[PDB]
Design a protein around this ligand. Sequence first.
Ligand code: GNP
Ligand code: MG
Ligand code: MG
Ligand code: MG
Ligand code: MG
Ligand code: MG
Ligand code: MG
Ligand code: MG
Ligand code: MG
Ligand code: MG
Ligand code: MG
Ligand code: MG
Ligand code: MG
Ligand code: MG
Ligand code: MG
Ligand code: MG
Ligand code: MG
Ligand code: MG
Ligand code: MG
Ligand code: MG
Ligand code: MG
Ligand code: MG
Ligand code: MG
Ligand code: MG
Ligand code: MG
Ligand code: MG
Ligand code: MG
Ligand code: MG
Ligand code: MG
Ligand code: MG
Ligand code: MG
Ligand code: MG
Ligand code: MG
Ligand code: MG
Ligand code: MG
Ligand code: MG
Ligand code: MG
Ligand code: MG
Ligand code: MG
Ligand code: MG
Ligand code: MG
Ligand code: MG
Ligand code: MG
Ligand code: MG
Ligand code: MG
Ligand code: MG
Ligand code: MG
Ligand code: ZN
Lengths: 123, 129, 314
Amino acid sequence: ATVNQLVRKPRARKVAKSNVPALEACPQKRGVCTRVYTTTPKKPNSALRKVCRVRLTNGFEVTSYIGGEGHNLQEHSVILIRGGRVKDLPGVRYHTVRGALDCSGVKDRKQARSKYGVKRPKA
Amino acid sequence: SMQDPIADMLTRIRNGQAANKAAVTMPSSKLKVAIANVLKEEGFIEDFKVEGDTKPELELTLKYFQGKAVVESIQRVSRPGLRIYKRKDELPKVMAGLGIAVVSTSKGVMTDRAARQAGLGGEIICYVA
Amino acid sequence: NLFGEPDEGIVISRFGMHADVESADGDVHRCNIRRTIRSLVTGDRVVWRPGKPAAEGVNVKGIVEAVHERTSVLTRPDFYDGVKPIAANIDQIVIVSAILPELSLNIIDRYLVACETLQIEPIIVLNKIDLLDDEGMAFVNEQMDIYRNIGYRVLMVSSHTQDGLKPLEEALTGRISIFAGQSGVGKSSLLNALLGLQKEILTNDISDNSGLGQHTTTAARLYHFPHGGDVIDSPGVREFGLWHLEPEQITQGFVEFHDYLGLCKYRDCKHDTDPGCAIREAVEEGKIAETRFENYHRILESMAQVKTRKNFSD
RNA sequence: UAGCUAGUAGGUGGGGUAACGGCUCACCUAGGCGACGAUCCCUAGCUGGUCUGAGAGGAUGACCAGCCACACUGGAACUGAGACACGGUCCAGACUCCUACGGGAGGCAGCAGUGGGGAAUAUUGCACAAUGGGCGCAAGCCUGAUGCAGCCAUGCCGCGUG
RNA sequence: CCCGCAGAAGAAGCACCGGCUAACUCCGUGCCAGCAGCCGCGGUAAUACGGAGGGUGCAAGCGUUAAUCGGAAUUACUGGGCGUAAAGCGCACGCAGGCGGUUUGUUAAGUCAGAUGUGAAAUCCCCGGGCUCAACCUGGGAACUGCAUCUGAUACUGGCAAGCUUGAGUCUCGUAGAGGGGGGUAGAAUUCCAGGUGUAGCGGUGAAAUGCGUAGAGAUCUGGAGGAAUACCGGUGGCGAAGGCGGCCCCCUGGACGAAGACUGACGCUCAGGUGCGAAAGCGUGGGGAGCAAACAGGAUUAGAUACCCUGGUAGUCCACGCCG
RNA sequence: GGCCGCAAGGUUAAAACUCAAAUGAAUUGACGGGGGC
RNA sequence: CUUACCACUUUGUGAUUCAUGACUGGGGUGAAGUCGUAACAAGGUAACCGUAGGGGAACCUGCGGUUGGAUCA
Ligand SMILES: Nc1nc2c(ncn2[C@@H]2O[C@H](COP(=O)(O)OP(=O)(O)NP(=O)(O)O)[C@@H](O)[C@H]2O)c(=O)[nH]1
Ligand SMILES: [Mg+2]
Ligand SMILES: [Mg+2]
Ligand SMILES: [Mg+2]
Ligand SMILES: [Mg+2]
Ligand SMILES: [Mg+2]
Ligand SMILES: [Mg+2]
Ligand SMILES: [Mg+2]
Ligand SMILES: [Mg+2]
Ligand SMILES: [Mg+2]
Ligand SMILES: [Mg+2]
Ligand SMILES: [Mg+2]
Ligand SMILES: [Mg+2]
Ligand SMILES: [Mg+2]
Ligand SMILES: [Mg+2]
Ligand SMILES: [Mg+2]
Ligand SMILES: [Mg+2]
Ligand SMILES: [Mg+2]
Ligand SMILES: [Mg+2]
Ligand SMILES: [Mg+2]
Ligand SMILES: [Mg+2]
Ligand SMILES: [Mg+2]
Ligand SMILES: [Mg+2]
Ligand SMILES: [Mg+2]
Ligand SMILES: [Mg+2]
Ligand SMILES: [Mg+2]
Ligand SMILES: [Mg+2]
Ligand SMILES: [Mg+2]
Ligand SMILES: [Mg+2]
Ligand SMILES: [Mg+2]
Ligand SMILES: [Mg+2]
Ligand SMILES: [Mg+2]
Ligand SMILES: [Mg+2]
Ligand SMILES: [Mg+2]
Ligand SMILES: [Mg+2]
Ligand SMILES: [Mg+2]
Ligand SMILES: [Mg+2]
Ligand SMILES: [Mg+2]
Ligand SMILES: [Mg+2]
Ligand SMILES: [Mg+2]
Ligand SMILES: [Mg+2]
Ligand SMILES: [Mg+2]
Ligand SMILES: [Mg+2]
Ligand SMILES: [Mg+2]
Ligand SMILES: [Mg+2]
Ligand SMILES: [Mg+2]
Ligand SMILES: [Mg+2]
Ligand SMILES: [Zn+2]
């Protein structure tokens, strides 16, 4: 309060906690799926979310979401994860880059193809 | 305890204006006399007088042009907890120069206008509007 | 797809978010439930499908899509919750009582009334006869005979010494039997003794302290009988009150009362002190068990106490 | 992370340095530092600046420029105006390589380039034509500095696809 | 860089369209599949999921992720708060520290003014110049808000010296007070013991039961023993820093207030660390133990009563000394 | 972890992880084994 | 050839740190299960604070304290 108090001890700002610690400020990371399982969402939402638990290159193990309808992911799959947050999935703060070196694009996706690694249909 | 008489004088003036008094009375001081002289010169206060010799008291006559207080804002800027000294160029302007800032320069106590017109910087005693 | 073709299955046990389902092949799996399903208890018959069995070298959670219509069901009214079922497709209930935790001619009567309203065949077993002395055994049998005198199958078994189970085993064969009763009566221990399940897997068993026992088993799990049929371990219960049942359904529940319906001069005979109440004099001469009459009256007056709630139970 | 410090803090004298100095030594004094944070621990090259912000501030130090430190790891000196020396010397260690098993050789954190790590970052290019630099009277030689080219939508700016 | 030839000829995608936020309809689906930055959507007409048409934005880019600042006054120096939303230590004393009544003199430390030196270039900004424009390069200027030195200024703060009495404190005379510590003592009342009278119940609850009573209870009278607390006064009352303090008296002792006068002469306020005090419960050792009463025993109620109620009842409650804080 | 305590524990005092709330006052109604007429 | 300084190293050890870890303690989130319903109205024995004891669980009881408690001429 008093300037004398600020002199005796200055104002310490609030450092921000990163909501994607496993990324280490890297835009993406590479990991291997150690387990693929179906989870349930928060009370407003009902579904069988397809998620995978992934052992990362930097030693971290985290659960990642798999967008789009269907996946070819299994055990021992080298996927690439990206930052993000799933509201209804508690403890899931990472997505999987559909189309990144093990996970293929979504089949017959026609709109927002770039968000799922679906090349432009030949037409 | 009383550790700043100047802020005391300022708040006496303020509360007297709020309570719509006609005259206030502080225990006088050379510095208090000089600040009162500035506000009488600037038409902020109608008049001031000092009485007594061993325990002199300063008395101020407050102004009310429309019954509303003539000095509608007054505040101590350089307090004992934190002193404020400004160089001549960066002297402040109260209400964009409509009001008056009292500053003690090496040549005595004068309005920011007189100070910067004399090219002198000093401790900013307070802002009177 | 990430899932196999749908198939019929039984509900071995229910655990909130997800249950245990046995396929016709006899392999049990943890399986989730769709939010459209509202009721799903042990013994239910469901259409489900398992997930593709490749994850961490173990099985992935299956999904249950729908449940078949129950044949029978055992329910119990719950304040703040209405009537809720414990286990469905049941064929027989076995009221398990034990002298040490509590002796309650009142809970047995409430269970009898319930199962009579549910048309399920009951059977009374009294556990831990090992604790009672031989005099005490002769002191418990001459009122356990109250029910066997109206045909009820009454057995006395000691789970710790495995004494006299053998007729219980016989009565249990080839049927679906829910083990019900107060907590601590020995329902889990009795199942361990009868099933003879592998030592590695046994039901939780904690001893009672002071007036009443703990609630160890908090689940309802089906178990395949060795000879034939199935049993179901159920969680212990404190109050089997019957406010959902209509007052007449309680007179019907007491089987020793049909011998006197229409023999009361007042047709709307409450049978307590109304003149000409046939069952009044019937119990005066000892035709009826006094304790049964008093229990009937007190459970009726209990329904008045628990009718305060405005919630519906239909 | 509350005490730390005995060459420690001073003085005299000797030695030593290009130069002052516990820089070093003998003796003497018993000091010195610390809550205005010593010591200890973790982290970190610094600045001009860069981003953001109305401003105060906040974050930061990629490119370019100035300073510093380092050259496989540890140590030491020589030569020299300048070094305790990236492409010098000696020793010790680890590793790699040659071996006649007797012993020897090496250091891309220079430019390309390879493997590896990573989400990720380029050619084993051309010329000393220019500007600098070394040597030389000069001619000239050397220069992966530098000037250019190659690759990449990485960014900014411009234009077209009528 | 200029000229010539041919031919529209070789060259458009990405995201979004529920609100925030510019852009909407059909079909499929039906709490499923799925979406989602936040609120959120989906169960039979879904502008929110997938496809299509239409539209919106940007464009050789467009989106997603990561990261920084901003918005965020959300660390509040500019520019925040603490009765109830987060936040006044339980209270007090007090060292360091922060701050400090009034007059005169001196000093010039802070402060202000001037001058000089310096603050590399680039970068940022302004006026121009050159690449066909721009990016880019470039001339000059401005700026570099800083630092240092010297010369002055003396109002304010600081230092020094001399004062002053208004802040603070001392003295004289009195007042009120459950302020504190120690020791006596009193009167009711509870319980117990002994005895006297005397009968059959007592006791307890909503109702009961347990329990006590024919050895004589309960009731009543007399005597005794012990412990604890002080009806009425009594209060919206007083005292104490807080916790707290209640019969009466004595001994020791703290503070507050009032009138008048004298005395000292800033001796003051606050206070990180530190020290002390500190309800009840609790702990150690040793006493004491009437009443009350966790635990425990019992009787009722109840599914149960492990509770509420009833009959008992231990630690404790009290004293001494420590501890706890 | 330090300090303190005989002990019970006290004091100083985080972080990982998780949510988009948590909260204060007041308004209208509804309800109460809350009152009044 | 010796002496001094001294890098490496060897013991006897101490401190500290990292990785792993037998075996565990509590926590968090989901929640459509189970047993009772603890609190919110006087929540049906007012809640809550400190402390002590007890109990499957929310909780019960003692002691002191608060109103952030209703009703009560
Ligand atoms: N003396 C004795 N104890 C027995 C006998 N049978 C079982 N017990 C003990 O009584 C207890 C009963 O616990 P459990 O079987 O879990 O009780 P439950 O009646 O199944 N119900 P809940 O699970 O709710 O407690 C256990 O300690 C068990 O070992 C017996 O015959 N004699
Ligand atoms: Mg329930
Ligand atoms: Mg059981
Ligand atoms: Mg109700
Ligand atoms: Mg010397
Ligand atoms: Mg010399
Ligand atoms: Mg470093
Ligand atoms: Mg701002
Ligand atoms: Mg820095
Ligand atoms: Mg670099
Ligand atoms: Mg290397
Ligand atoms: Mg030399
Ligand atoms: Mg060097
Ligand atoms: Mg060299
Ligand atoms: Mg090299
Ligand atoms: Mg290289
Ligand atoms: Mg040349
Ligand atoms: Mg060469
Ligand atoms: Mg390009
Ligand atoms: Mg719009
Ligand atoms: Mg809808
Ligand atoms: Mg539709
Ligand atoms: Mg759509
Ligand atoms: Mg479209
Ligand atoms: Mg800010
Ligand atoms: Mg605030
Ligand atoms: Mg609160
Ligand atoms: Mg608060
Ligand atoms: Mg306070
Ligand atoms: Mg002063
Ligand atoms: Mg001072
Ligand atoms: Mg100056
Ligand atoms: Mg410059
Ligand atoms: Mg131009
Ligand atoms: Mg002065
Ligand atoms: Mg005097
Ligand atoms: Mg303190
Ligand atoms: Mg006490
Ligand atoms: Mg004691
Ligand atoms: Mg004792
Ligand atoms: Mg009691
Ligand atoms: Mg009982
Ligand atoms: Mg005493
Ligand atoms: Mg309740
Ligand atoms: Mg209550
Ligand atoms: Mg108890
Ligand atoms: Mg109090
Ligand atoms: Zn009848």
